[PDB]
Structure formats: C-alpha cells, structure tokens
Subunit: 227 residues, 3 copies
C-alpha cells in the first residue's frame, strides 16, 4: 500500500518498498510545502527533462541520500560530471528495478539544462510510466498534447499526473483531451498555473474531465492518495 | 479585415490590429522580394525553430521595432542574451495575447541555433496555430509528415502554410497527406526550392491536393490573401 | 541483387551498385566481427543520431573512402568541421541519390554528440527508409515505440531493422507492436544484447512477431540476406 504525494509544480513523491521522487523542484519552489530536510530517505530520483524547475535539487538530494537518478542519457551524463549516481535510459525504454518497472514515455517539450548562462543539451523531454506492485502511475512531465499518449490506453493506468498550466504546457482543454486518450482510472492535475492560486482553473478541469467520464482527484501541494 | 502576406521561404506577415511576422528570414533570402526596410511596424515575431533561415533577422527586427519574440524557452533564452524582449512558450502550449491566441504545435525536425560556428541547442521545433478574430492560421514551420497534425483537424483551420521543398522537409506527396490530416479550408505551399526552379512542384501539389478536396492557393513571394 | 549484412549493434551494410553503411560503430564495438580494414569500399554513410555507438567511426571511414555522410543538419555540421563530406537532410525529408532514395523517418530518442566530455546538440534522432531498385529497407535507428511508425505501413517495407534491447530502446513487447504497425515482409532484430546472451529475448521476439504474420530473420553479427 504505497503513498503518493504531490508537492507542487510537478513534484511527485512515491513512498513504498523504496522511496521515489519525480522532478524534485523543492528549493526555490514557492508552491512546495516542504523543505529538502522535510523529505524522507530517497532511493531513486526521476527527472523528466532538463529544465530547472524539474531537474530541481536532484544533485543535492542524490548526494545526501546516495540516491540514483533515473533519466535520459544526456541528462545522466551532465549529472555524472557532478558526481551523481545515474541509471541512464531513453524514450520508450523500460527497466525492472528492485522497487518495480520504470518506462520513459514520449513528450513534446524542450530539455535544455541551464548551467550558468549556457544552455546545455539534455536530450528530449519525457514522462514516466511506473509499475509498482501491479499499480501503474503515469507522470506526463512537461508536455503538450500528443497522439503518443494513446499508446498508454492499453496500460489501464491507475493514476495519471497531467500538467494543466498552459503556455509552457497543455491548458485545461488539451489536458482533458489527453485524459480521454489515456483513459486512466484517476487523473491528478498538476503544474496547474505554476502558481499558488488556481482554484478556478483546476476546478474547471475537474468539471470538464469528469463530464468525459474520468475521475479527477484534486491534490493540493502536500496532499496524498493511496494505492 | 486581415492581410496575410507570404514573403518566400517560410516568411509570413500578418497585418491586422497588430502586426506579426513568422520566421523572418529577410536579408540573405534571395527569394524574398522586400528588404528589412520594406517591412511595416512589427509588434510580435514568431520563431518556429533555431535554424538560420527561420530565426533570420529576428534580433534586428525586434530591436528596431521594440517587438516581442514568441518562441520556445531555449530560443528565447538565446535571444534574451542578445538583449531581445521575449515571451517564452513550449510545444502544445498556448497563450492569449492582445491581438489573439497563439499555440505552439509539434513538428518533426531539428532546432539548432548557429552562433558563429557553434551549434547551440534551440529546444525542439514547432509550428504555430494563430487564432485572430475567430480565424485560424496554421504555420507548420519546418516539419516532416507527423500524425500529430491530425490533432488540428477539429480546429477547422482556415489557412494552412505547409512546406513542400523536400530533403529538409516534406515533399509534395507527403504534404498532400498532411493537408488531408489537417483538413484546412485553404492550403498554401511554402519553403519550396529557391531560385524559382520548382513551379512544376507547386502546380503538382495544387493538382494533387485539390483532388483530395482541399482548396490550394498558390502565393508567389509578395502575394497576399484576406481573412 | 543486394547483400544486406548486419554487423552487430545497429550496424547495417548494404552492398549493391553502391555501398552504404548505417550507424558504423565498428572499432569500439565488441560484438562487431570485422574491423574497419574488413569493410569494402564505402560510398555513403548514414547516421541516425549523434550517440557514439551509432555515429561510430563515421569520420574515419568517410575520409579513407572519400564517402559522403547522410544525416540531419546538426550532425552534418559537426562532421563538416572535421573535414567530412556531407549531405544534410531532416526528419521526413527525402532525396534521390544515384543508388536510390533515402528518407529520414521520425524516432523518439536523444541525439547528443559526445566530443571530449562536452555534450553537443546533434538535432533530433531519426530512422532511414531506403528505396533501392524497388526494394525498401527500414532502419529504425534508436527509438521507442511511436505512432509515427504507422505512417510506414503504406510503404510496404521489405525488410525492417528494429531495436529490441530495452532500457535505451524498445523491448520485445513494444518491438512486436512496432512490427504490427509497420507490417514489413521481413523483420530483423538488432541492438538486442548486444552481448551474445541474452539470446532468449531474440527467440521470444521471433516467436511472438511471427504469430502476427511477420517473418523474422535472426541475423548474427556477420550474417546477411539477399534482397
Ligand atoms: Ni519544462
Ligand atoms: Ni529547418
Ligand atoms: Ni542512442
């Protein structure tokens, strides 16, 4: 019975046999309810793409916990030069870890790593399909709407984390279209405005996505759900 | 009223409440009939990807007109260090501007920025779906045929600008397939071979696309249409 | 007549009226049974993406043979500064060469070029659809499962080279799904171990993909087929 906690932006913590965290943007994230010290022991870190507000505090968390970062080849190379342990993958690749299976999914987004004022190439953006104890979590990462999401329909995803922020990522309308393509058991909106207050827009997502027959669990940063 | 002018390569000028230009490759472009001075006042510049013949004169046009560049995060970061004002987006993201709505669409291509003799990462390539006064223009940018184009069918696009040059982008055969996926009211071919040695190709496209029930409006560089 | 030889990793040699090699990872490749000296005269070199185990010995082979490298714009720019002849293309673009037609196909993968310990942007990853004397060969490059593969069904591919290694690329299950999307007459697994074992993966692929009516030819590094 694992515990899945949303911590603002696109940060998702998964506590089970091991502890996994996705896109750990904690320090400098005004919507995140915890500090780095408030996180438990971290075994694995999943990074969807290179942008600063997803790559986040991965280096500091990896070193302090002796955790392995799971990401694409280019991101793992960049992190390797910082003395971070990594398990490289790429888009559409899967691997069976001790805790369960992780698969990188396609996404439509940039993956530039900002280092100083230089833009370093961090591969292509992704999502993650994670299979733990027969339960499937889909974290879309930063992405626009893409027909590749229809590949996840046969997976029967238990929970789908989709961005609804707009501008940099799907808005409410497209996120509803993604939710219908994927058809998960539940959908959690995230990255809703990249803002502290979104109540109007996130409720509009819940209303519209449930009209299409997909249950929406709104999790405020800090809140959890069980699987 | 709204005037849309094709200026060769992938250059598209849209004149209405505000003036916006897409992929402004003007100086250096031997098929572009106007110089930089022949352009009106520009409010916004849209860049689909980092390649020189699309990024073009964005820096100079922006500085002279105090215009804002709309492109992906990585391209806007590059332009920001040149002292250019930007509004960053990414693939599948939309935003409502004063003149209308802009949405970045997926493309299958590259997006390298050539700065001197170094290849800087300019994110992933895109197109643009612009909504102005209930009228929709689709500019595909440089792209190959992709199933993501089928997402635009429900938009009921009025004018679609598709490249047909081949080698770097779609050819005539594939561009006809894209038109049928998108089902726009009108389709304008662009980015065709330079030096005007390809009037046989554009006519073949017009013939082939209209056999599939899509009106084709051929525009020589300098010509326009209304919306 | 045509002799198509698989040389381990994703190395494919095509011998006809001209000699073409794809992703020439020879010298550092432990599974490749030949050395550079063991190759015949090479006329063209095709590179799917920038990763070292595919870009391989392209520079050295091109200079010795005075061969031309066909790849995306960013990869050809990188090779152009090494004094290598190139024909740049991009995703979805095709060109008719003397030996036949080459077309770049979409892929879901990174294309980072490692130069020293610096990651250079090498465009987006691709595959190649090659038409020689009315026969079609699809080399998927490194890629996950993508809905773009459905576009190749109408091509009626004679031989498809798909990766089945997992982790960095599609595993056996996903590779079967790709074969059903593409519907080639024959399919050849590659990039599997590439270590001799696991061999049971390759046998499982053969069994499963032939249940879907697609002939599977298992080529050991060194083995060939006529086309
Ligand atoms: Ni992002
Ligand atoms: Ni281009
Ligand atoms: Ni690779």
């Amino acid at each position: 019975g694992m515990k899945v906690t949303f911590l603002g932006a696109a940060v998702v913590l998964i506590e089970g046999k091991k502890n996994i965290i996705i896109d750990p943007f904690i320090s400098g994230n005004p919507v995140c309810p915890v500090k780095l010290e408030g996180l438990p022991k971290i075994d694995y870190i999943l990074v969807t793409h290179g942008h600063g507000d997803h790559l986040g505090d991965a280096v500091e968390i990896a070193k302090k916990n002796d955790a392995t970062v799971i990401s694409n080849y280019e991101i793992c190379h960049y992190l390797g030069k910082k003395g971070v342990k990594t398990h490289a993958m790429h888009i559409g690749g899967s691997y069976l870890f001790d805790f369960g299976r992780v698969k990188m999914t396609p996404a439509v987004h940039g993956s530039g790593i900002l280092d100083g004022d230089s833009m370093i190439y961090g591969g292509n953006p992704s999502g993650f399909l994670i299979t733990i104890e027969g339960k499937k979590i889909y974290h879309a990462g930063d992405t626009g709407l893409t027909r590749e999401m229809e590949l996840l329909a046969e997976e029967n995803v238990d929970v789908a984390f989709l961005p609804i922020g707009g501008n940099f990522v799907m808005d409410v309308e497209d996120a509803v279209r993604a939710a219908v393509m994927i058809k998960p058991k539940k959908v959690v909106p995230m990255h809703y405005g990249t803002w502290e207050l979104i109540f109007a827009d996130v409720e509009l997502f819940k209303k519209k996505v449930e009209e299409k027959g997909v249950e929406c669990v709104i999790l405020e940063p800090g809140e959890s759900l069980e699987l």
